[model samples]
Every structure is written in C-alpha cells, then in structure tokens.
Target: MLIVPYNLPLPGGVVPRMLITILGTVKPNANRIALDFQRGNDVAFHFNPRFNENNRRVIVCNTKLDNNWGREERQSVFPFESGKPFKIQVLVEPDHFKVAVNDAHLLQYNHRVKKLNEISKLGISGDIDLTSASYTMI
Candidate 1:
C-alpha cells in the first residue's frame, strides 16, 4: 500500500468543495489502475479503472474503513479510452464526492467517513503513466 502524504506537499489540507485533479495516461496494454483519497489508513474514496479485468471494461469504485472494504460500485461504461490520456477531477462536497473524467461528469460517491479534514492523503497504483496530480480548494 503506497500512501502519498499530500499534506507535506500541500498545506491547509482539503476543504469541503475542493477540486482535486489527477492527470495520467492509460497504457496501450493495461490491465487496471486506481486512484484513492484517504483519511489516515482509511480510504474515503477509491477510483479504479479496469481495462480487461474480466474480459470487459469497467470502473470499480469503493471505500475502505478500518481494514474492511465497502461494497463495490461497478460501472460498465468506461470513459477512459485505452492508450489515451485522462484527466480526472474529484470535487469534494459536504455530503458527497463528485467525479469527472476528461472534463465530463462521471459519478458521485457519498461520504462514509464524514470528517473531511482527516482525508489528507492520496494514493495511486496499478499500470499507467502518471504524469501529474494536484488539488485546489474551491
């Protein structure tokens, strides 16, 4: 588990209604990739794109509490094109989290862990070209 301490690079942490941007590219022969927003060891939100996990394209979104993972939310319609660049933006709202892919609205994941201030870490893993990533308070 790779935990990125975003707090060191960013001060003031994440405020409600903040815009988090992650820019990367999918590999031509990729299997999967994931991006996560974390509160300590808990994952507040998880964004996973599967190219061919089960002979199909899908996106799996979920959260982890304690050491247990919540119910997985799977989407069949994948916005990420293979071998293409992707810009993912996550808007952190008070009650929910909104996600956008390549400037288009994708989905919203509600808050399971309500303390927004605790979510100060970010993590990215799997197979892809991660060029740049950052966030801003709105």
Candidate 2:
C-alpha cells in the first residue's frame, strides 16, 4: 500500500480540481488517484486504493489523506463499481470537496477535508489506472 508522493502548494480559499481520464482502465467500488492536500505521511488522502463502494458516491476527509479514517471520509452519490471508464472531477472549495463524475453527475462531500491552507501536498495511488487528468485551481 505504498505509492508515490507529490507536494503542491495549497494555501486556502482556492479551487483545485483535476479532469482525470483513465489511461489504462478504471471502475467503481475502487479508488482513483487525483491529488492530495495537507498531508505528511500519517495524514493524506490517496487517489486510488479507495473503496468507491456501492451506494457510495463520494469520499470526504478531516484527518487528512494519509492513513485510514477513524470514521468515514465524505459522502458519495452513487456506488462506484470496478472496470469502467469515467470522468472524475474533484473540486476543492473553501470548506468542502465537491466531486463530480462525468460532468453531469455531482456530489457534495463536506466532512472529508481538514485544513485547506495547511494542505501542501498532492499525489495519486490506487487500484485503477489513469490515462489523462487535467487540473486547474482558480
């Protein structure tokens, strides 16, 4: 359960998102690698290695994205199975992680993120593969 590490500067009140396209192939009920914010080692949210389970549509964070959550991350809209290709857009707002899949679908995950400013890292790790992911923080 070890992946790469990437540190990106994310102060606060900034909008960071990525349009990820699976390079190999991806599916639901699994994890996808996008980006991380405010994490050192024992605190971080990974892209892949997730359980986008059934009836679950989102993943929120509070203790950062490093290890396992004491409770749960965020709430999901729909269950993310496996072996399917789709678009996952993660929006980092001021106090919430707005997740939208395929543009037309959306979900709100508030209890998942912790400090927006203290967050100064980003990385990808999981079960599925990524093709291309475009991101822009405004």
Candidate 3:
C-alpha cells in the first residue's frame, strides 16, 4: 500500500490532451477520499468521493482560488464502492477535465483556473490503498 496524501509534481504541467490515471482500492470502512489538481497554493480541481455524507454516497467536485472555495458540483451516480478496486482517468481538455471511473464516463469539471499550464501538482489522499498513479501526454 502506498502512503496516503501522496503528492506528485507535474514537471511539464497540465496541458490539453493530457491523461492522468490512478488505480486504487477503497478501504472497507472508508468515509471519504480526495484527489486534487493544484496550482501552487490553489486547487484547480478537487474531486472527492464520500461514502457517508448525510447518509448518502456522492461525488463532489469543486475548485478553490485565493483560499476561497467556489460552488460545489455534486454527482449522485456514485460509481465507487467500499473495499473494491477502482480505476480513474482524468483527461485534460481545453475547457474542462473529463473524469471516468472504472472505464465509464463520470463527470466533466470546467476549468476554474484558466491557466492549465500553471497547474503543476497532483495530490491523492484519504482511505484507499493506492496501486499506481501516472500520466500521459498525447
């Protein structure tokens, strides 16, 4: 099991047509897990999956700029499960990021931090055993 709160620096930064992939297995008693694409101290995209939010399972996507968080975008079609393996793909496009879980399309989060190239880090944390994380530019 890889360490929690894993941080990876994107030396080339994010750009159009970049694809980021992550593989992990959810903890049996997990309540939440989060993935963040960050630009310096700001979070360009925040992807969070909650298994126990108000007694509901949902995925929340949002952004934080200048220490202030923007409106939360929540999706109720939860594709993750506790104690199961999951594969996540995040495709960075010109206007938004397309996210897919377990090979199925999940959500599209519009760019909040317009400067995509400035986003230089990827963070993963909370209740999961990370197997692998990587990116490809094409």
Candidate 4:
C-alpha cells in the first residue's frame, strides 16, 4: 500500500524521467494475487501458460531499458553454497530486473500469469534485499 517515488537516474542514464522503484505487497491485476516484479531494461527468458487469474504474481521484467543501453539487469537463482549464511535480494527495481540474493530463496517467487502491463505491480513478502547489488551487461 506504499506509493514511493524515486528520482535517481541510472549511472549511465541518458534521459531525465527514467526512474526506478521497489514495491512490496502491492496487489496487482483484477484478481489481486501477490507476486514479485521486474521491469524497464527488459529481457524475458520465457513465457508459460500455467499462469492464470489465480497466479498473476510471478516474476517478470523488461528486456531493454528505455535507453536501450543493454540488458544488464542480471539475476542468478543459484542454490545454497553451504556455510553461506544465506540471504536473498528483495530489493526490486520496478523498471529493471536487477535482483540481488544471498541464499537465493527469494528466487522462489510464485508462478503467476497476467496481462503485459500486469507485472508493473508487485507483491513481495518474507526476506528482501537492502544492499545495493551490482550487475553488468554481457
């Protein structure tokens, strides 16, 4: 239920209005299922049909940033590496798929299906990321 606004431009941003945000527990879609979200610099790995009205809360993101800079919003769903203490990145960039996790449990976002613009809204629960994770385009 928070509507926070950000005015920070990306390190290499070329525009002024291009912004990023992190939303939590926000109910998206006509059904109101809860799910994490990633947007802006967009790249989609794949699409599944199993997502239905009941599952409109899966993780998604844009492949290219409006700047068309590079698909660098990177994420890794790696398994625990033992003695790692374990941590997860809940810090979601609304316009970018930049994810940071420690143990990777946050990658367990539920499966959801919704309209193209549906992912713009997100609902994140449990452990979240507070540190500034880093990424580079390949």
Question: All candidates' lDDT scores?
Answer: 0.78, 0.48, 0.93, 0.28
Question: Higher TM-score: candidate 1 or 3?
Answer: 3
Q: Which stretches of candidate 3 lie over 4 Å from their true place?
A: none
Give, for candidate 1, the lowest lDDT window spanning 10 residues: 1-10
| Per-residue alpha-carbon lDDT of candidate 1 for residues 1-138, written as tens digits (9 for 90 to 100) | 123222222244466778888877777888888877888888878888888876998989899999899999988868987788888898988788888998888888888877778787778777767777788777
Best TM-score among the predictions, by candidate number: 3
Minimum summed lDDT over a 10-residue window in model 2 is located at 1-10
| Residue-level error in angstroms, candidate 2, position 9 | 7.3
> What are the per-residue Cα lDDT tens digits for candidate 3 across 1-138?
678889978776799899999999999989999999999999999999999998999999999999999999999999989899999999998899999999999999999898888899999999999999899987
Candidate 2 stretches greater than 4 Å from native: 1-24, 27-38, 42-68, 73-76, 79-81, 111-114
Task: For each candidate, give its TM-score against the true structure.
Answer: 0.88, 0.55, 0.97, 0.24
Candidate 3 vs. true structure, TM-score: 0.97
Which candidate should be chosen as best, given lDDT against the real structure? 3
How many clashes does each candidate structure show, in the order listed? 0, 31, 0, 17
lDDT of 3 at 37: 98
Better of 1 and 4 by lDDT: 1
